[PDB]
Design a protein around this ligand. Structure first.
Ligand SMILES: [Cl-]
Length: 361
């Protein structure tokens, strides 16, 4: 398909950059591109949408120095823009850089921390890190071996409270001998991050997931990575606290046996339903290759997913999507950050709905 922009924003022959996260700032009309740099830290590149040239002008890479705990590796950048306050949240995971004394005695001891840094100046400067572990997870902490959030952008609902929903997953130590099994879930806050609730797990063996909100009443749809041949999806009518039965979305392939992370976002319908969904993920049946974009015009119905349009041929892995307002051709504008070329780079792609799905126009 034709695109407005395609450029590598992170590159490393040593596969130093992985796990992309993209965040669009609607007022500034800018993007924040985050990635993990292998202790492991989170880096960022700011990019302004230059209307006159309809191109994002990426600035110099910088380390998010605040997004780190002493003696810990930082990973899984999970950004969010709070439309009510304008504040930016960068949630992330912190794990000890070396085996701890506790782990020497208990191999599966949980030593993973949930953290956040916030910005009130559009991401130029960040607050000192805040450890949300105890407040968000509580007594369930010891029942897991580790957990993570995202990766990729989180969600803010259009409910009265403008609730924050952070997609996550935990490796549950259910069997003393058998390896911990991961299950996806959501963290939910109705007060802009002051308090948090941990939602119930969806089906077992679900990893990295992302959530979006759509009209159908408003529901939260969770799209997760699986070890099966298809993606796993579930919907919640209570902001992610409880999900209805998980479903296999056969139209969205997953390459076994490991699967791959994918991204999903909602955007205003270009036409009965209020929102449509756009999702990106590799399209090869058993390899992480051929990144494709899929559309769901009647979300989140599993059977409504479109055939994918190829965004990039070849090696492609993890990706993150963001809607960026209206494009130069009048149709919705999108930004996508994805891993490519055997993890040697993270590429930024910008395209419109009209470019990707011409049949719609
Ligand atoms: Cl903004």
């Amino acid at each position: 398909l034709p695109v407005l922009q395609k450029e590598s924003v992170f590159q490393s022959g040593a596969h130093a950059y992985r796990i992309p996260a993209l965040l669009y700032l609607p007022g500034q009309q800018s993007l924040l591109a985050f990635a993990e740099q292998r202790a492991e830290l989170i880096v960022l590149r700011r990019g302004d949408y230059d209307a006159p040239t309809h191109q994002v002008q990426w600035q110099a890479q910088e380390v998010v120095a605040q997004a780190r705990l002493d003696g810990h590796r930082s990973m899984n950048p999970c950004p969010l823009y709070d439309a009510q306050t304008g504040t930016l949240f960068l949630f992330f995971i912190a794990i000890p850089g070396q085996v701890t004394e506790q782990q020497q005695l208990q191999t599966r001891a949980n030593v993973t921390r949930l953290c956040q840094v916030t910005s009130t100046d559009h991401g130029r400067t960040w607050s000192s890190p805040r450890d949300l572990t105890d407040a968000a997870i509580g007594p369930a902490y010891r029942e897991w071996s580790t957990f993570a959030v995202g990766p990729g952008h989180c969600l803010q609902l259009n409910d009265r409270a403008r609730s924050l929903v952070v997609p996550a997953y935990a490796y549950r130590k259910l069997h003393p001998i058998q390896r911990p099994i991961p299950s996806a879930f959501c963290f939910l806050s109705h007060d802009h991050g002051r308090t948090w609730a941990r939602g119930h797990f969806v089906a077992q063996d679900t990893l990295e997931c992302q959530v979006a909100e759509v009209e159908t009443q408003r529901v939260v749809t969770l799209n997760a990575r699986s070890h099966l041949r298809a993606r796993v999806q579930a919907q919640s009518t209570n902001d992610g606290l409880d999900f209805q039965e998980s479903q296999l979305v056969k139209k969205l392939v997953e390459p076994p046996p490991q699967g791959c992370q994918g991204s999903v976002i909602s955007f205003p319908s270009p036409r009965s339903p209020a929102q449509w969904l756009l999702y990106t993920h590799p399209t090869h049946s058993w390899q992480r290759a051929d990144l494709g974009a899929y559309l769901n015009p009647r979300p989140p119905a599993p059977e409504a997913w479109s055939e994918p349009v190829l965004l990039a041929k070849g090696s492609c892995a993890y990706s993150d999507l963001q809607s960026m307002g209206t494009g130069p051709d009048g149709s919705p504008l999108f930004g996508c950050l994805y891993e490519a070329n055997d993890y040697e780079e993270i590429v930024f792609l910008m395209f419109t709905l009209k470019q990707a799905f011409p049949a719609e126009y």
